[model samples]
Target: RLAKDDTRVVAYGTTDELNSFVGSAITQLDENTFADIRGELFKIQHELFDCGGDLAMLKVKEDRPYKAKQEIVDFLEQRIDAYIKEAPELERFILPGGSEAAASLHVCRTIARRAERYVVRLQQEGEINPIVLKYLNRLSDYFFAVARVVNSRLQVPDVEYE
Candidate 1:
């Protein structure tokens, strides 16, 4: 599907990678502790497609229109805020592992961060739906907040950074 290793290709590829990890993370969640989160991640799976689809486009056509938008980014921010309120207070930096589901979410967190960086690199080279980059930025934070809450609900303490 790729003609060359263009920055745009790399950006979308990373988005796909992040999406796969999110899928894997979703499977680790339990219905008892994570029914709400399971539903949220399923929605995010489609949103990641929106991001990847927008990045794969060479240009936005008037008829086609961009799928990635500010609303997508705002939704992630809203979810992140709600999850943070449910999570325990953090006094310092923490390592990424806790419960199985939380650890998987942390994997999603780092992959989303990687996708954001790739989008940034692509932006410097040419035009892109800038909202995709914003979405990826907030997505990483959303994963972090959700991971913390997952750990909290599982009675697992976050391993503080030494």
Candidate 2:
């Protein structure tokens, strides 16, 4: 039994879908990089679960209720910073085409952005954690970094938009 027409549930479903797409992309990477991505993806998947929980109970008035955890945002920030260290600094915008895995990752990144917008919209309507919005924003950045990492590891040059 669940609440009908719940926007939080809708947002949860969207984020869950994006997470699964990222998980599928993980299987397409080489062993070393796959190991790295898998760890990060697992952490993200857990955070999505937390986001869903927060959405599910958004209307409930309770003490110490479930909320988006800070660890999720911290992990994304750490990964994004680490990835930027190894990736080439952007001089110009690049196309979203490259290795199949990289392209799929780009797709996931866009979906994450969409999910982030939905969460923000829901927040405007009712009580919701701003951390959820923050997490999604950072997650998309992490995906972009991972896309570059995939291109580098796979020896695929990023297609520059000229």
Error of 2 at 21 (Å): 1.2
| Ten contiguous residues with the weakest lDDT in model 2 | 55-64
What residue runs in model 1 are displaced by over 4 Å at the alpha carbon?
A: 6-12, 59-64
Error of 1 at 60 (Å): 5.0
Write down the TM-score for model 2.
Answer: 0.90
- TM-score for all predictions? 0.89, 0.90
lDDT of 2 by residue, 1-162 (tens): 557766656655757888788778777777765688767777788788788777655566675366687877998889888888877887889888699998888888998998888777777556777678788898889989988888888888888899
Best by lDDT: 1
Residue 43 in model 1: lDDT: 89
**What C-alpha lDDT values do all the predictions have?**
0.84, 0.79
